[PDB]
Design a protein around this nucleic acid. Sequence first.
RNA 1: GGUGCUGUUUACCAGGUCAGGUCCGAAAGGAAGCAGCCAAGGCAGUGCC
Length: 69
Amino acid sequence: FDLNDFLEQKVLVRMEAIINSMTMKERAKPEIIKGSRKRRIAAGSGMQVQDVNRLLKQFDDMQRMMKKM
RNA sequence: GGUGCUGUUUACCAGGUCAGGUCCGAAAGGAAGCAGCCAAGGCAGUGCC
């Protein structure tokens, strides 16, 4: 389960945008996403790092939740 | 080294374009621009100078 999947799944249009500013690798191995990349993604989707982090957090709980079944 | 081809590789760090999203504007319209793509570079092999 990676960001590509999470993507499959109102303000949902603003979350797509964020995932849409990522590279393939970032979508596949989300953990590589640190400061500099967030900086790039957020600006690339007219967002803000806090937005990105939120999205990354939602994906995380979605992962952990399935990483327990 | 140059040049051509092929394989491979490259988040942002003043290439082009720019889906999506963002910004400015009452609007008409403007602006920047991620991913992608193209290009370009890196690592090699082959041909030619």
